Amino acid sequence: MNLEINNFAPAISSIGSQLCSLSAQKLLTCRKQYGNGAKSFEEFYAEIGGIIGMMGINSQTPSGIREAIYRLYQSAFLFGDIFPESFGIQNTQNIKPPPGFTAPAKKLEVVLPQGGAFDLIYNNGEIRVTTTRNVQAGDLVCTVTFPIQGSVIATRNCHVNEIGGQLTTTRPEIIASVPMPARTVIVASFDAIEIGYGEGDDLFAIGIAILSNRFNGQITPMSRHNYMTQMFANLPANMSERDSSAVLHFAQAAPVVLGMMERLTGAPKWVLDY
Amino acid sequence: MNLEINNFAPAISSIGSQLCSLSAQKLLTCRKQYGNGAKSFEEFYAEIGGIIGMMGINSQTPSGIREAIYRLYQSAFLFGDIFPESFGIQNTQNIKPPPGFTAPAKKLEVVLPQGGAFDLIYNNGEIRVTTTRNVQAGDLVCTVTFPIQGSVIATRNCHVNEIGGQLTTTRPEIIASVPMPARTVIVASFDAIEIGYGEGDDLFAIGIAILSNRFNGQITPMSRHNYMTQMFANLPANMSERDSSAVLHFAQAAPVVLGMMERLTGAPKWVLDY
Amino acid sequence: MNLEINNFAPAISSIGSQLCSLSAQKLLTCRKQYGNGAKSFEEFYAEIGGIIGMMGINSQTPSGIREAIYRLYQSAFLFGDIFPESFGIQNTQNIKPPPGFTAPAKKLEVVLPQGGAFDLIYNNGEIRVTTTRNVQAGDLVCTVTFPIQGSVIATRNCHVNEIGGQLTTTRPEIIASVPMPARTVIVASFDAIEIGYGEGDDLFAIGIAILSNRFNGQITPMSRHNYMTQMFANLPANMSERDSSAVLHFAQAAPVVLGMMERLTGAPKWVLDY
Amino acid sequence: MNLEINNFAPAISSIGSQLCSLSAQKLLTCRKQYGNGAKSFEEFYAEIGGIIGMMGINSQTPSGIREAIYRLYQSAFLFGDIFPESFGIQNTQNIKPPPGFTAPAKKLEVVLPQGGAFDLIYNNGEIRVTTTRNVQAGDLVCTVTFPIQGSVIATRNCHVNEIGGQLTTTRPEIIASVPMPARTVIVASFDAIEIGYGEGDDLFAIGIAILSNRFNGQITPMSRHNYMTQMFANLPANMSERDSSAVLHFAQAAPVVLGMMERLTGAPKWVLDY
Amino acid sequence: MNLEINNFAPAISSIGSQLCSLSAQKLLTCRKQYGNGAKSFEEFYAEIGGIIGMMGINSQTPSGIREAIYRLYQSAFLFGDIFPESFGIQNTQNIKPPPGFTAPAKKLEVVLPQGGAFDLIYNNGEIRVTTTRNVQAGDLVCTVTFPIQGSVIATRNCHVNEIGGQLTTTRPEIIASVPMPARTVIVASFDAIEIGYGEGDDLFAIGIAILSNRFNGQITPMSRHNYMTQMFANLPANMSERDSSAVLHFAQAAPVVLGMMERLTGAPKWVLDY
Amino acid sequence: RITEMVNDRRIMIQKLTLAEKPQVMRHVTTEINNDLFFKMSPVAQLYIYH
Amino acid sequence: MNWSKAINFQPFMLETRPPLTTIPIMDQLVEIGERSNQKWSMTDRLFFAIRKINPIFVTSSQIPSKFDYTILQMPTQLIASLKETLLFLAFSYYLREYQDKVGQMKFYPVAMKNMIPIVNYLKDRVHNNFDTTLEQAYRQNVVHTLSASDAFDLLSGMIATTRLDLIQRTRICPELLNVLNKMSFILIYAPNRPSILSWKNQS
């Protein structure tokens, strides 16, 4: 999944997320006001619903918000560098912080050091490696390349840097604590939160297909974890942690909102409360 | 793919075809006068493109026409014995002839005799069989089960009933014309048209999925040729050729118009000029 | 089929084509405004379908149009010579260019040179030739007598004068490039268009019967390909290619309109857009 | 041909296609009311065939449309990446969808795996290869570089991904399914549609010469299929299907309209109904 | 020719015969006041020769009365069962006797006994059979299945029930009168009249094709004698001789009127003077 | 008869009362051909001028 | 989701229409039958009325039909009784006020059991009395000899739908409730209970 993110991405994302939140709020408001009858819920949504007061987006149809999202997504993550004012988006440093990540870390990503000293297997929240040879205490075995944050539980035959049960660093590295012979296994489990959001996986599955049918040369259907990892690995090097969250929030909200507009169910809290 | 054609199918299909034709005319009328401006083409269409004056529509949006198409298709072709009580089907006194078929006969359907004397393969516009044992001239080797009409070109070692190059019957049978040894090859190419419409195939492809997502248990995505062959095979025998054409026109036009509503491109002539 | 085409054919053909175009445009208009009612569509068309704005029809009924077509056809293709060849009509009455041909060339017509050195069989769009004896490179194997224009695909053991994939001349001849031992095979396929129009074959089949009932001795039922080949073969040698197209357009349009007035379906784009 | 396509090609194409459709509609409008008198149709068209209200065009004669087409084509496809300020471009994102492709895929474009293992010969709509050496089941044989959509017919000794006879991916790959020794042959026929619009091929040939007599250093006369293959090969990688469709539509419409303004016949449907 | 005749056939047939008589009178009246002029006779008839009004039918075009004939024919001779039988029996409305049959009996229909003792050859109004073996005098050799009325002439070696030269029964039976050896001959000539009308046979031949093109699955072109025999044999078992006469009169008058509307010649007396 | 003619106009007539349906009336329509006046005549120029 | 507040589109009624080309001709025949006395009611003399009740087995919906004379049956082998026949006749008579006169299509309930033997049996032994009516026979045979529940079960078994289906469909369309009220039926609805049935006379 190839894509070129411009450095002006936070400016586009601050608008895209606001548009998505407004659409979700309108959907909820008009969803609580529906009485069962001759018209289906799709017709009711397409007629009375979909009316938002937002500057820079002059469409009150569901299709209009749909292509506003299309244009904003294409500008923010695929075209390349492009100035926000070109599409009528005012570029302002002053923006709002996005909600914090709530994605549960199940398949945490690690990279073995060279030399083939160890072999790695995965579990629901833990990584277990086996020593193919003798190893002395005080050397790296694994390191997470995908930033993680949370508490640590059930650390056996290895040591991690932590105080009070909380991981000190966002990229912990596991170091063997005592030398081990005879092909034993060391286990590290975590109660942590990765990058992304947990609620709304059903909507993402259809939204990713919706926006892959358009940008088929750039995006392919996949799980949310893989999409988040690919998006995170492609951010520009020189950008603050404040702008990265703003970019990633829109990066995940666009598919889920596109899916929510198809299946007129509810919306996740991290989309509404922005 | 299972389906039961009800005994009032032509009356349903007349209303459905008229609705599809009106939708296509509205789409092209809105498409011709879309001057490039602030709004995109889809907000322009989804605002005035659904205002069609016809009995049975309970909305002025494309969602209403989509739901009307769903109801008419379910009543006409699917197992559901629900009669649409809000359209004008009850008051119909006469029907209009549908446009003539224009689908090229590339993969013509043939059924071999039970003997096992021949092996059948396929080409772009012809079939050819190889004899396994000695066969005397004057007996059937092939016959077409799918109705066809047109001229015959490049026949070899076989005779077909024709005058002036034009086929006589709509279901010609191929019979040997020369006593031949085993392993002899015989061919028959046709410049003919099968039951169906050749234009708007991408629209059919993107609409068959749309109407299969809803009727998942009854309809599965497939090619236009297989869909038309199954529809024809499921037609009752007590049907005039004028009513069968009216049924088949709607059977093919419903997916085409459903996909047309998604990608707002043009419409085929056999849909608009109904 | 024996017929005598005079030097006045384009002038009569212009009037015939205009009449056919006007008749078809009226049918689409009447067809668009039929409302289901006690009166059938046949009666509805027969009561208002003949009121067209055109001089030269002495009746406001479809019978008047049919008789006008009959008399124009008889004057143009069957009567013989009218007036001396020096009679000047082109100077005062100019004609309108007919639409370009659209009929695909499936059974392309070729003639083998004298000597019986070659074997000819036909296929869907190509011809393959089998050599009975040894042949030297650079001699005629075939030449087309029915004009053709378009691209060329898949030439094997033969060379055709072309640039950029496009045939240089309307009457290509096939020549060899490599000396061929006996029993060799040389093929030539073309993605090209022959003389005629490809749409409206169902109407042509019954229109040719309608106009063969009246001119029983002169015209016989046949396929469209044979009819057009004979019509092109009967054209006078001292006639421009800009007038031959005008003659052929009416020659094929008259049966199409005659059969259209029986089966009240739509009309081909070539008859309508004259 | 040598030609460079800039990032703003869709914006230029959306104006060029609109101009082409306007000119074609005006041509038919004037063709409907031709007086058929002493003046020829060429003088009639030269007198009243112009457009008076479009920003960008500076003459009320057809020459103005021709000169505008020349400017737009040079800006969009040639070496000079000049942005035409004279035509009014307000949003480079808004792009009306173009009609779907209609060109039959006769000469399908495929590339061999580079192992020198198969021989390639072409036919009307199918490719067939012969194994030079022994090949095991389950490996690549051919793959298409020109995207294709449609159905599949007569698949022998090979496997393609298909659902109900319809191709799944737009670039199918042919892989052998059975261990096949001793220089056997496999076939694969497709009843599909390539890229471009089949109709109006006569006008393309005469218009490509018109626009190659001007840009002789960059454009040479050739067939439509090769022209479109090279034009698609020159498209940038960072290009969606929504934009490349508009680029290709203008790329084919410009020669067709240029040749239609010379031979004043009709216009194809895909040009009129844009 | 397969068809079923319901019990409402006389009521339908009275209306059909009245319509046929009115159309014939209209044609003759318009024929006697035709002044030779620019307008042809076919155009002259179409304008003011189809405008006939009566109870039920209200059409003013020849197509209108053609469709009325189609409706009546389908409702009388091809529709399975109109109503419960008692509804028809309790009808009080009365009908008018049709004209007497005038068709000469030339190929009289007879059946041989199960024994196979005799061989039957036909002539003009004459049946002659020969004896393969010796048979006793005074036994049935032939019986007549098609009803016949009239005089009897030239009876040899056989006896028929007649007084004063006139047959007594409608279905005469031929019996031997004198003992005979093998290879003898017995003859029986008849000057009689069968079911049908002899005049207007040319119109029947071209009207049967017209009404067979519509009901292709049920009606096929054939001779008048065979048509009448099949229609008589397909009559319901329980019907008075008064009603069958009206049914047969309509059954024969429909094709002759259909053919008379095509060839604008006079109408027969049995159609005109109903 | 009035409601069944097809032309540029939609004719609407209120349905007749069940009792007032048999009521009789006279409507004379002429039956004569008018094509014999439009022949070629030695005074056609006079017709055109006047 | 299959359900409608229209009486004509209930699951127990069949839609019928002649072939679309023979519609004008069948109209003339219906006028011919109106000229004769071809209509049965529940108020005319049973001697006259029983002469015009001729149920016909249906094999296809493309059949001509008249609103005041047609009653339909499906091909079966079961034999109806007098009470079932009277219930069905009353149902079909009171169900025809809601027939759609404007349209070309007619709706009719179908009889699950064969009523021809019972109709012939009744027709063989009816005298020409001046006061006996079909409604009188219904009241003497069904109302006065059966409980409401048993008669409702018989009616449910005389059409395809089961007893629970009738009770459910009665709540959606009020026209069915009026039709059943004309047949002297009463429905009482109470929470946490199945519905009870009673005749109008005892309520």
mmCIF file of C-alpha atoms in Angstrom, chain E residues 26 29-30 33 35 39 44 47-48 51 53 58 60, chain F residues 1 4-6 30-36 38-39:
data_model
loop_
_atom_site.group_PDB
_atom_site.id
_atom_site.type_symbol
_atom_site.label_atom_id
_atom_site.label_comp_id
_atom_site.label_asym_id
_atom_site.label_seq_id
_atom_site.Cartn_x
_atom_site.Cartn_y
_atom_site.Cartn_z
ATOM 1 C CA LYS E 26 -66.699 -0.491 -46.079
ATOM 2 C CA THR E 29 -68.078 1.235 -50.783
ATOM 3 C CA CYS E 30 -64.684 2.949 -50.749
ATOM 4 C CA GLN E 33 -65.980 5.740 -55.359
ATOM 5 C CA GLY E 35 -61.238 8.320 -58.585
ATOM 6 C CA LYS E 39 -53.168 9.199 -54.090
ATOM 7 C CA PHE E 44 -57.073 5.928 -50.124
ATOM 8 C CA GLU E 47 -57.543 7.026 -44.670
ATOM 9 C CA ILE E 48 -61.349 6.367 -44.709
ATOM 10 C CA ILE E 51 -63.174 3.770 -39.650
ATOM 11 C CA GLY E 53 -67.895 1.790 -35.344
ATOM 12 C CA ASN E 58 -63.984 1.770 -31.575
ATOM 13 C CA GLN E 60 -60.497 4.173 -36.994
ATOM 14 C CA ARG F 1 -65.904 7.483 -29.797
ATOM 15 C CA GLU F 4 -60.887 7.167 -27.947
ATOM 16 C CA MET F 5 -59.546 9.453 -30.727
ATOM 17 C CA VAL F 6 -55.730 9.923 -30.394
ATOM 18 C CA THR F 30 -70.296 13.129 -44.230
ATOM 19 C CA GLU F 31 -68.900 10.212 -46.244
ATOM 20 C CA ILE F 32 -67.369 11.635 -49.421
ATOM 21 C CA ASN F 33 -63.909 11.596 -50.966
ATOM 22 C CA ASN F 34 -62.208 14.978 -51.328
ATOM 23 C CA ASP F 35 -59.309 13.772 -53.488
ATOM 24 C CA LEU F 36 -61.052 14.432 -56.816
ATOM 25 C CA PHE F 38 -56.992 18.196 -56.315
ATOM 26 C CA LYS F 39 -56.361 16.999 -59.864
#
